[PDB]
Design a protein around this motif. Structure first.
Motif, PDB file in Angstrom:
ATOM      1  N   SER A   8       1.117  -1.047   0.140  1.00  0.00           N
ATOM      2  CA  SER A   8      -0.194  -0.245   0.198  1.00  0.00           C
ATOM      3  C   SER A   8       0.775   1.588   0.183  1.00  0.00           C
ATOM      4  CB  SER A   8      -1.273  -0.020   0.943  1.00  0.00           C
ATOM      5  OG  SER A   8      -1.650   0.236   0.755  1.00  0.00           O
ATOM      6  N   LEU A   9       2.358   0.910   1.093  1.00  0.00           N
ATOM      7  CA  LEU A   9       3.198   2.262   0.625  1.00  0.00           C
ATOM      8  C   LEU A   9       3.482   2.660  -0.670  1.00  0.00           C
ATOM      9  CD1 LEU A   9       3.208   3.305   3.032  1.00  0.00           C
ATOM     10  CD2 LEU A   9       2.652   0.999   4.043  1.00  0.00           C
ATOM     11  N   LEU A  10       3.738   1.461  -1.545  1.00  0.00           N
ATOM     12  CA  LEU A  10       4.301   1.557  -3.208  1.00  0.00           C
ATOM     13  C   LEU A  10       2.715   1.373  -3.725  1.00  0.00           C
ATOM     14  CD1 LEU A  10       4.206   0.097  -5.827  1.00  0.00           C
ATOM     15  CD2 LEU A  10       6.256   1.822  -5.416  1.00  0.00           C
ATOM     16  N   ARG A  11       2.010   1.233  -3.709  1.00  0.00           N
ATOM     17  CA  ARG A  11       0.637   1.329  -4.351  1.00  0.00           C
ATOM     18  C   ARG A  11       0.309   2.427  -4.023  1.00  0.00           C
ATOM     19  NH1 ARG A  11      -2.658  -2.357  -5.127  1.00  0.00           N
ATOM     20  NH2 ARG A  11      -4.563  -1.843  -4.902  1.00  0.00           N
ATOM     21  N   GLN A  12       0.827   3.256  -2.863  1.00  0.00           N
ATOM     22  CA  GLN A  12      -0.133   4.440  -2.674  1.00  0.00           C
ATOM     23  C   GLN A  12       0.674   5.887  -3.573  1.00  0.00           C
ATOM     24  OE1 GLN A  12      -2.978   5.504  -1.426  1.00  0.00           O
ATOM     25  NE2 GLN A  12      -2.858   6.305   0.505  1.00  0.00           N
ATOM     26  N   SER A  13       2.502   5.598  -3.517  1.00  0.00           N
ATOM     27  CA  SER A  13       3.204   6.647  -4.037  1.00  0.00           C
ATOM     28  C   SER A  13       2.939   6.286  -5.472  1.00  0.00           C
ATOM     29  CB  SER A  13       4.732   6.137  -3.542  1.00  0.00           C
ATOM     30  OG  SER A  13       4.533   6.926  -2.181  1.00  0.00           O
ATOM     31  N   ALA A  14       2.833   5.015  -5.997  1.00  0.00           N
ATOM     32  CA  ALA A  14       2.603   4.500  -7.347  1.00  0.00           C
ATOM     33  C   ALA A  14       1.590   5.403  -7.954  1.00  0.00           C
ATOM     34  CB  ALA A  14       2.602   3.620  -8.031  1.00  0.00           C
ATOM     35  N   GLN A  15       0.929   5.327  -7.153  1.00  0.00           N
ATOM     36  CA  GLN A  15      -0.459   6.617  -7.949  1.00  0.00           C
ATOM     37  C   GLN A  15      -0.833   8.104  -7.808  1.00  0.00           C
ATOM     38  OE1 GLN A  15      -3.931   7.426  -5.091  1.00  0.00           O
ATOM     39  NE2 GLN A  15      -3.924   5.302  -4.754  1.00  0.00           N
ATOM     40  N   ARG A  16       0.838   8.470  -7.551  1.00  0.00           N
ATOM     41  CA  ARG A  16       0.863   9.805  -6.941  1.00  0.00           C
ATOM     42  C   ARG A  16       2.221   9.784  -7.831  1.00  0.00           C
ATOM     43  NH1 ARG A  16      -3.788  11.210  -5.340  1.00  0.00           N
ATOM     44  NH2 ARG A  16      -4.052  12.672  -6.823  1.00  0.00           N
ATOM     45  N   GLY A  17       2.559   8.746  -8.752  1.00  0.00           N
ATOM     46  CA  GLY A  17       3.847   9.237 -10.001  1.00  0.00           C
ATOM     47  C   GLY A  17       4.995   8.760  -8.227  1.00  0.00           C
ATOM     48  N   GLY A  18       5.444   8.952  -7.308  1.00  0.00           N
ATOM     49  CA  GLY A  18       6.254   8.787  -6.831  1.00  0.00           C
ATOM     50  C   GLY A  18       7.000  10.181  -5.380  1.00  0.00           C
ATOM     51  N   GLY A  19       5.865  10.862  -5.050  1.00  0.00           N
ATOM     52  CA  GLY A  19       5.830  11.775  -4.563  1.00  0.00           C
ATOM     53  C   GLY A  19       5.521  11.537  -3.106  1.00  0.00           C
ATOM     54  N   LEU A  20       5.094  12.704  -1.770  1.00  0.00           N
ATOM     55  CA  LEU A  20       4.892  12.536  -0.929  1.00  0.00           C
ATOM     56  C   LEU A  20       5.008  10.953  -0.286  1.00  0.00           C
ATOM     57  CD1 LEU A  20       2.209  13.551   1.364  1.00  0.00           C
ATOM     58  CD2 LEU A  20       2.808  14.681  -1.181  1.00  0.00           C
TER      59      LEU A  20
END
Length: 53
Positions: A8-20
């Motif tokens: 989820s940490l990645l899948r979440q950072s992925a959906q954001r392109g790679g931010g936050l």
């Protein structure tokens, strides 16, 4: 909340392109995420991998 969490940490950072987390929590990755605390637990695991790579 182990291993599978990093997902989820990645899948979440992925959906954001790679931010936050890229620079955010990465603003003090060497300081041990000293510039976080509030939310460095879930981001930590992902912040630790950033240093691992």
């Amino acid at each position: 909340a182990s291993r599978r969490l990093l997902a989820s940490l990645l899948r979440q950072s992925a959906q954001r392109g790679g931010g936050l987390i890229s620079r955010s929590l990465g603003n003090s990755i060497p300081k041990s995420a000293s510039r976080a605390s509030s939310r460095a637990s879930p981001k930590g695991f992902l912040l630790n991998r950033a240093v691992q790579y």
